[PDB]
Every structure is written in structure tokens, then in C-alpha cells.
Amino acid sequence: ETEIAKPLADFAYSLYQLEAGNVFFSPVSIFLALAMVFFGSNGNTNTQLLNMFKRSFVSSLTIDEYYASLKLANRLYANDQYPILHPFLKDVKRYLSSDLVSVNFADTEAARLQINKWVSDQTNHKINDLLQSGTVEANTRLIAVNAIYFKASWDEVFDEAHTKPKKFYPTPHSSIKIPMMTQTNGYSYYETEDYQFLGMDYYPEYLKMFILLPKSGKTLSELQQKFNETLLNLVSKVAEVKVTIPKMKFEKQMNLVEALKKLGIEDLFIPGKADLSGICVKEKLYVSDIVHKAYLEFNEEGTEEFVADHPFLFFIFDSRSKAILFIGRFSGN
């Protein structure tokens, strides 16, 4: 549980810094995807994986997460031609509640459609078309598709009649008028010279969303180069706040190969060089594409003093495991 939290949060931020005005993804979803190939990898492939996200222990994390709903859709799709080692299929289910499925890549479009529909199922049809065309090819060996579906009501829902459009400042010069939610209520709170830090509970209340709102004459960009830690900000919160935050919708699809390459994971995507001998010994597998989509709303109702009217960072936190389920940024597009 907590043993995973610290390298998970360090991985979360590292990817967040490689990122575009608004950002939204699930560190946990990608981290368990990496977990799957780590389990199946050896040699240099496995070392670059191990050095990236730092035997598991994650089976302790996975058991934490379920029971509103939180559903993981973590899955490898392996070309038909390849026999797959049985211990890997057992461990990936036992310790990660994930699996590898052998699939007919002949008829590339139909396989792609079957996968996107599988992903739709586990995401109550809110993560759809996760695979874009030309991510699968009749000779593709291994693709990883990756998402978490999170639906939860605010502990303290907003009164829709107070949702007034207000000025939001991508930069102190410029301005754009957007719908914002307001209410006055009890919230977790902490403050420095440089930012405010707000906690908004979901229900159940160990699910919370957090916002780091830069104060004073500091922009998000300069502040970002000073974290993360985010997990420590957790420990320091204690307050009644009048909260005004944008009411918005995040739907980010991301092909992660280039970010993960930049992070130091490379052999995994190189044919011939990738070592997935723990998945298939009778043929050379390699990852053509890891694809991730993340959906989430700032809604009066939840997912689907403090005025967040300039750029801010946000993350969705599970206090049980201390896991950063989602991390993101809102800059006004």
C-alpha cells in the first residue's frame, strides 16, 4: 500500500513535467501497465523499467482500490501467433488484477474495434475509442491499453444555481470567461507565501481532490519546478473556505511511448532488443504502443477565500494507499 505510494508519486510528477496547457492522466493506470511488462521482462528491458518506477507488493496496492466506482482496465493484447508463458498470466492476474489476452490481429480494424469496446465496458462507456486507427497492424506483437474509470460524488455537492461564468486568467494580461462553481463550506486547507492548497473530499471521503493554487506574483510554471511531496502537502492540511473552481471536463488520450522513452524506458519498444522472455519464450515480443485515456469532470455533482481563476495543478488522492490516482493541470487551454 504505502510502500508503492512514494515511487508512484515520483513517477507521476516526472511524466507530468514532460507534458501542453491542460494535462490529465492516471499515474496509477500507467504504473500498473508498467508493472505488467516489468513482471514479464528481463535484462536491460527490466532494468530500465525497474529504474523508472522503482517482486510486489503491488498486490497490496491493487486490493486497496475497489469499492460510486473505481474500475481498472489494464490489459496487454498479444498477437495470435504467440504462445504465452502461463506463470506470467497467473502473476499478472494474482498481483495486478490485470491480464494479457491473445487476439486475432488479422482484420486490424476489427481487433481495434473489439479492444476499444472492451475498454468502454470497464469505464461505464466513458473511456471510448481509446485506440486510434493505425495503432494496430496485422503483424503487431504486443499492445498495452490502459485506463482507470473513477466516478464519485463530492462529499459537499455544489448548488448548480451558483455556477456563474467568471473571468479566468491564463496569464495576468489575458482573460477568458468560463463557468465556475462556488460554495462556502468546510474543506481541508493549507497555505504558504506561494500558493494555497485545497482539499475537496469525495464520498467515500478517503477519496479527495487537491488543488495547488499559486498565490501572489507566482505562476504555475515557475512553481512547478519546485516539486515533488505532493504527498507531504497532504499531511499539512487543516478550515472553512469559500471555494470557487472552474467547472470543466478532462478527456485526454495519450500515446505514451515518447514520454516513457524520454523517461528512460527504451528497449521495451525496440524490436529484437526488447526482452519479454518472461511473456513469450518461443518468439521475440516487443511493445508497439502503450495507449492511455483519462476522463474526469469538475461537476457540481462531483466527477460527472479560494478562487481558482489562474493556472493551477490538481490531483485525485486515495488516502488509503496514499496513491496519486490522477494528476493534472488546468491553464485555461
The helices-and-strands tally (H runs, E runs) of the chain is: 9, 16
d(CA 65, CA 63): 6
Place of cell 525497474: 50
Angle at 175 between CA 169 and CA 177, to 5 degrees: 95
Same fold, 2-152+250-297 and 155-246+301-330: no
Q: How was this structure determined?
A: X-ray
Residue 128 vs residues 123, 202, 303: alpha-carbon distances, Å: 8, 24, 17
Task: Parse the chain into domains and list their residue ranges.
Answer: 2-152+250-297, 155-246+301-330
Those residues whose C-beta lies under 8 Å from the C-beta of residue 214, and which sit 6 or more positions away, are: 194, 195, 220, 223, 310, 311, 312
Strands 164-168, 176-186: parallel, antiparallel or unpaired by DSSP? antiparallel
- Quote the CA–CA distance of 123 and 148 in Å, as a whole number: 7
Look up residue 158 and give its three cell numbers. 455544489
- Rg of the chain on CA atoms, in Å: 21
194: region left, alpha or beta (phi > 0 left; psi from -120 to 50 alpha): alpha
Q: How many whole angstroms separate alpha carbon 3 and alpha carbon 14?
A: 18
Residue owning grid cell 444555481: 161
Q: Residue 269 — φ and ψ, nearest 5°?
A: -100, 5
Buried b (16+ CB within 10 A) or exposed e, 80-95: eebebbeebbebbeeb
Q: Exposed, middle or buried, 12 (CB in 10 Å: 0-12/13-18/19+)?
A: buried
Residue 108 burial (CB count, 10 A):
16
**Which residues neighbour 333 within 8 Å (Cβ) at sequence distance 6 or greater?**
21, 22, 170, 176
Whether the bond into 57 is cis, omega within 30 of 0 = yes
The order of strands in the sheet holding 176-186 is 164-168, 176-186, 240-246, 306-307
Q: Facing residues of 211 across strands?
A: 198, 314
Chain-centroid distance of CA 95 in Å reads 19
Q: Which of 195, 257, 255, 248 is nearest to 223 (CA)?
A: 195
Burial of 159 (0-12, 13-18, 19+ CB in 10 A): exposed
Q: Which CATH superfamily is domain 155-246+301-330 in?
A: Alpha-1-antitrypsin, domain 1 (2.30.39.10)
| Beta-ladder partners of 314 | 211, 328
Element of type H or E holding 95: helix 86-96
Discontinuities after residues in the chain (C–N over 2.5 A): 19, 54, 67, 228, 238, 304
User: Does CATH place domain 2-152+250-297 in 3.30.497.10?
Assistant: yes
